[PDB]
Amino acid sequence: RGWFDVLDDWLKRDRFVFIGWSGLLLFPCAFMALGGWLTGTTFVTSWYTHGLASSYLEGANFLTVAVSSPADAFGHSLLFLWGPEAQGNLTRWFQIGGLWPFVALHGAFGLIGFMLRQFEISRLVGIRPYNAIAFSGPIAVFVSVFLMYPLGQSSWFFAPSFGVAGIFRFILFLQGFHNWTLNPFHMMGVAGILGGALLCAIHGATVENTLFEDGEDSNTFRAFEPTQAEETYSMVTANRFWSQIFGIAFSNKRWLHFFMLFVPVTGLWMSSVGIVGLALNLRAYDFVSQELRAAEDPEFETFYTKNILLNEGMRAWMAPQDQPHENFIFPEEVLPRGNAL
């Protein structure tokens, strides 16, 4: 028994927390990402990068803490602790936003490790690896939003900050500057996510309301046995119900569950494609035909042109505070605004 196989045995033991070879990458990297985020949201400020308090130590709450993105002056520097910026000074590394790349990079490798874990466990137990394939969706989202978008932009500063209100800021920023709602790829993402939720709800309810009478209790949960060979609910009755209610119904269980995988995953992937576009400011910002007609015809108004106006207002009012490194100075009189407001 060579040392490699002895290690393989130890790593793949049946214990409370399976480790596996993938655990070597997953657990330290996941721990770094999670502990870095908790440490930043508890203790670390964004005063020097954003001019914002972003930790419990400064009086922020769960909704307003964040591991904020680094200062825009660093471009896409990876901001290693030992790098030319912090130069091994941990306190400075915290103050310049080193925690953001720390968390982002360890999270990316922890995500890799987790998908490798999915593969490893699927191989060990003897099933098909469709869980890893499904997890590719969240991976695409994380790569596109947290890595690809800022890499296309001027710096990590424009990456989403790891915090609740930081994420909301990123969301509103994308609306105002990129008109992300108008983007057909975001639209397909929305459809995928809403359809996934719909499928989850409808499938759970359908199963729960076509159950077979397999027990005597009003509590129907105890009339199932994991080793039972037969279906626990009536696919035939479910199909008839949905055919008569909605017009169509699933008749193939395998297709149903594959569809439940396919919908949200496809949605995540399409929205990731859209975010890649936004990284290069390749927006679906405008419909030129309506823009031209409005520029010539002062009576032409659509909801599209109204949304354009909202975006203009948001940009002008938010940019000075959202981009403090720019030293934007917008005198009050240049701010766009409607009457009386």
Binding site: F18, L182, T210, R254, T302, L310, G313, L341
Partner: protein, 334 residues
């Protein structure tokens, strides 16, 4: 026997290709009415003075909209919450200019979806099923009612109902955020958890079932042909799926009871959507999301910003531009 009994037997018949039922006797007319009007208005309706300031907004395709920008525009702010049926307009042109189609479509649609939920119960009763699919359906219905009925009621005008269009939906959302800070409202946070988690659990359940499919096909044909409609035998190995998942996270976090698993799949998104519907319905009464603007002060008393202040800047930018000609007085109360 009697003509009425025969009619009853027909309406409640489980042999109709589409179940009608007593709820169907209301659903079908109202839904067809809403659909016909919606199609006609989306294609060809003239512009609507939504803000009541004689500034009509073009919603239909024939007036220069594409599919993304087109909409059935909410009725005029001058109408407010008044009932505006066709017969209360001096002319069809007047009814159209003031946004009557929106009211017609919305009222019929809402009647129809409530009858759809009743019809789901009715058919489950006729088929001897358990009765609670309609309860799951009450989540989307609640959200739709919030955005088309409850919010306009609280705000005092159908002009503030969600427009029946894509870009109109986005406009609704942006203004809603500007006025209520829905992102910082925990019920919307719960709705987001509902939909993100529902999609997560959909992907997880679908993938685990697909992963544990029993070999019944060859590598050439679709594995879907391994399942035959109406078999009792289980088409996948739930114990193998539990083995995998309980090793992915840990044993006691994995369901091994399919009934409890499917109850959880039903309950999670439904509860999340109920909560976000209630969030919209209560922001209808202007009980808004959290306001932490200037919550953090330094020792001298100067405000230290947080991400909430940046969000508020965005909200103000949206607010000052929205309905740019509609406001005469400094506070957007109505």
């Amino acid at each position: 026997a009697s003509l009425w009994e025969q009619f009853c037997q027909w309406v409640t018949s489980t042999n109709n290709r589409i179940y009608v039922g007593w709820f169907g006797t209301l659903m079908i007319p109202t839904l067809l009415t809403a659909t016909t009007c919606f199609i006609i208005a989306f294609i060809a309706a003239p512009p609507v003075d939504i803000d009541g300031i004689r500034e009509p907004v073009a919603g239909s395709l024939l007036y220069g909209n594409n599919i993304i920008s087109g909409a059935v525009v909410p009725s005029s702010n001058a109408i407010g919450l008044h009932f505006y049926p066709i017969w209360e307009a001096a002319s069809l042109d007047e009814w159209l200019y003031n946004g009557g189609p929106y009211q017609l479509v919305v009222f019929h649609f809402l009647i129809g979806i409530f009858c759809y939920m009743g019809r789901q119960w009715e058919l489950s009763y006729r088929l001897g099923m358990r009765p609670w699919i309609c309860v799951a359906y009450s989540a989307p219905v609640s959200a739709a009612t919030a955005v088309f009925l409850i919010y306009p009621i609280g705000q005092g005008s159908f002009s503030d109902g969600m427009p029946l269009g894509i870009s109109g939906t986005f406009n609704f959302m942006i203004v809603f955020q500007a006025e209520h800070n829905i992102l910082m409202h925990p019920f919307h946070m719960l709705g987001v958890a509902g939909v993100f988690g529902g999609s997560l659990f959909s992907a997880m359940h679908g993938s685990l079932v697909t992963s544990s499919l029993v070999r019944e096909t060859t590598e050439v044909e679709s594995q879907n042909y391994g399942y035959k409609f109406g078999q009792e035998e289980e088409t996948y190995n739930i114990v193998a799926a539990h083995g995998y998942f309980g090793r992915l996270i840990f044993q006691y976090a994995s369901f091994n009871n399919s009934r409890s698993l499917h109850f959880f799949l039903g309950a999670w998104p439904v509860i999340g959507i109920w909560f976000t519907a209630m969030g919209v319905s209560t922001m209808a009464f202007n009980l808004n999301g959290f306001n932490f603007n200037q919550s953090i002060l330094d020792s001298q008393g100067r405000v230290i910003g947080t991400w909430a202040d940046v969000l508020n800047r965005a909200n103000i930018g949206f607010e000052v531009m929205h309905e740019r000609n509609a406001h005469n007085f400094p506070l957007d109360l109505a």
